[PDB]
């Protein structure tokens, strides 16, 4: 019901042939997106029936560079706006596109945007964007409530159905009428279901309500406590104490999260705190992107010695082509022989030609995947020219997908128990353009590579 979004703003897909498959794997049967909804580079006849269950997005929605004619998001109710596209916008529809390109937005359920604005630019075939009252969709306390709508078109749009009270519509159909819940309120209530004073919603309900109580509204402004909209989750110091996870109160933190003494589920321990394994709580070597190497994007010869004699890295490991050309040497890679856990992802887009495998990570056991490359991948291997993997001690992939493509000499890809490594019904192995299996449980040749 809860899934993690992606962060690949306006970027080309890592694997063009598996983009739709990765989207389907990430968003199949998901109601709440904990991140950004990025639907980009969709062909004309793409089937997007897996997005029909999405109801809430924590970050921002980005629909760009799509040849689809319709994107079926008709149950989405609220966008939190925790993250913003270009630091200003919560919804972005850019450069989309029968000639092709989306023709209607069809967001008849969207009612509330907590933080951010709307950006709609360069959509030749899009219609019914200037007739939507965007002030109604913005929360009354929204600070960055700005709109930038480009209405340039290459076609003429029919008027929507006369069933609408005004001319505000999300499409041509009669059920694409826009519902107003802010500008029709009686008195000072931010949300309402009608023009009467008794039709206002509870103060803790965000996107609208069905009744005046705090248990019968479409969304929770701050937190959902077993169907009750509450400003704060119940404190732990307490048999009724609950942990904070997104916008809901939970009994226990999820599988790949850290429980803080404050009472929230986070992905990294705070300052002056140490992770303790019992589940793990917040009661050391730092990788790329963790407070010392935040701007560093590769493991070069100027920082490889920081990982010497380490057993757990609080970060990621990226091996770009620039890492090996002072250029890195194969003899320097042995500093990772003692590595056993990676908190982030493992990215390898380059490798020495004298190494027939990834044996320098022989003792690596867990890739936590709390930080994902492009927001979706925790293990990527492309253009390596390796004969076999050799990750003998790997047992768990905490989060994210595994992408192994364009390795023309790689065998033993399917001889690995990948399903045993995953701990979520959202992870999968995407592999293309490898050595054909016709010409090709273990990790490599020999008796020592058995799983």
């Amino acid at each position: 019901q809860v899934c993690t979004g992606t962060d690949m703003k306006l970027r080309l897909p890592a694997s063009p042939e598996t983009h739709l498959d990765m989207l389907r794997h990430l968003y199949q049967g998901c109601q709440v997106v904990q991140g950004n909804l990025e639907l980009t580079y969709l062909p004309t006849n793409a089937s997007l029936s897996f997005l029909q269950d999405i109801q809430e997005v924590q970050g921002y929605v980005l629909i760009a560079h799509n040849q689809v004619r319709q994107v079926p998001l008709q149950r989405l109710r609220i966008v939190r706006g925790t993250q913003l596209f270009e630091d200003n916008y919560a919804l972005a529809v850019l450069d989309n596109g029968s000639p092709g390109g989306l023709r209607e937005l069809q967001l008849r359920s969207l009612t509330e945007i907590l933080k951010g604005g709307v950006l709609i630019q360069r959509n030749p075939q899009l219609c019914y964007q200037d007739t939507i009252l965007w002030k109604d969709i913005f929360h009354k306390n929204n600070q960055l409530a700005l709109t930038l709508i480009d209405t340039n078109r290459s076609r003429a749009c029919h008027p929507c159905s006369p069933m609408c009270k005004g001319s505000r519509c999300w499409g041509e159909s009669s059920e694409d009428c826009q519902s107003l819940t802010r500008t029709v309120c009686a008195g000072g209530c931010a949300r309402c279901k009608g023009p009467l004073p008794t039709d206002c919603c509870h103060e803790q309900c965000a996107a609208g309500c069905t009744g005046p109580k705090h248990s019968d509204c479409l969304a929770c402004l701050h937190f959902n406590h077993s169907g009750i909209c509450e400003l704060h989750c119940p404190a732990l110091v307490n048999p009724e104490g609950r942990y904070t996870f997104g916008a809901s109160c939970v009994t226990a933190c999820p599988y790949n999260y850290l429980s803080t003494d404050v009472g929230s589920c986070t992905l990294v321990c705070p300052l002056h705190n140490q992770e303790v394994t019992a589940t793990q709580r917040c009661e050391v070597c730092y990788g790329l992107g963790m407070e010392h190497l935040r701007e560093v994007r590769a493991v070069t010869s100027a920082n490889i010695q920081e990982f010497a004699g380490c057993k757990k890295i609080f970060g990621s490991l990226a091996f770009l082509p620039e890492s090996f050309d002072a250029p890195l040497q194969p003899e320097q890679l042995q500093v990772f022989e003692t590595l056993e856990e990676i908190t982030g992802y493992l990215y390898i887009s380059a490798w020495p030609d004298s190494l027939p495998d990834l044996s320098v990570f022989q003792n690596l056991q867990v890739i936590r995947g709390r930080i994902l490359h492009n927001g979706a991948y925790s293990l990527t291997l492309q253009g390596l020219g390796i004969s076999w993997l050799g990750l003998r001690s790997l047992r768990e992939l905490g989060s994210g997908l595994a992408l192994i493509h364009h390795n023309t000499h790689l065998c033993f890809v399917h001889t690995v128990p990948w399903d045993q490594l995953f701990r979520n019904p959202h992870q999968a192995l995407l592999h293309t353009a490898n050595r054909p299996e016709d010409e090709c449980h273990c990790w490599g040749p020999g008796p020592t590579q058995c799983v």
Partner: nanobody
Framework: VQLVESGGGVVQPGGSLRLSCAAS????????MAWYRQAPGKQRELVAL???????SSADSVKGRFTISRVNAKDTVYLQMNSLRPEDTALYYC?????????????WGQGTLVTVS
């Protein structure tokens, strides 16, 4: 809503310094962000102000040396100080604003000390 500054320190004249001030407790953003400073014995004067759109203003005595930037995702202000002079010694307070129900609510930090010597 609470504001915390983590920028102050002691710098030699002609040096550089950067101040930051993040906010917590808001799910809607902020109207505008500003930096104020207080020299010994004087009142609090505006150093730099930035709008939500991105319009930047600065005081006449720091033009060309003080730059202000904001990140709406993190609700943070920044103030890069270059070629610091001895008269730049003051108490720097970050400032945030919010338009709510037709009125503006002001939020102040605890202040940070920057001494140039």
């Amino acid at each position: 809503v609470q504001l915390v500054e983590s920028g102050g320190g002691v710098v030699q004249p002609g040096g550089s310094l950067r101040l930051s001030c993040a906010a917590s407790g808001s799910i809607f953003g902020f109207n505008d962000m500003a930096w104020y400073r207080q020299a010994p014995g004087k009142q609090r004067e505006l150093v730099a102000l930035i709008s939500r759109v991105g319009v930047t203003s600065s005081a006449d005595s720091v033009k060309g040396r003080f730059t202000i930037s904001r990140v709406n995702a993190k609700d943070t202000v920044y103030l890069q100080m270059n070629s610091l002079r001895p008269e730049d010694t003051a108490l720097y307070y970050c400032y945030m604003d919010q338009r709510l129900d037709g009125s503006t609510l002001a939020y102040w930090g605890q202040g940070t000390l920057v001494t140039v010597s």
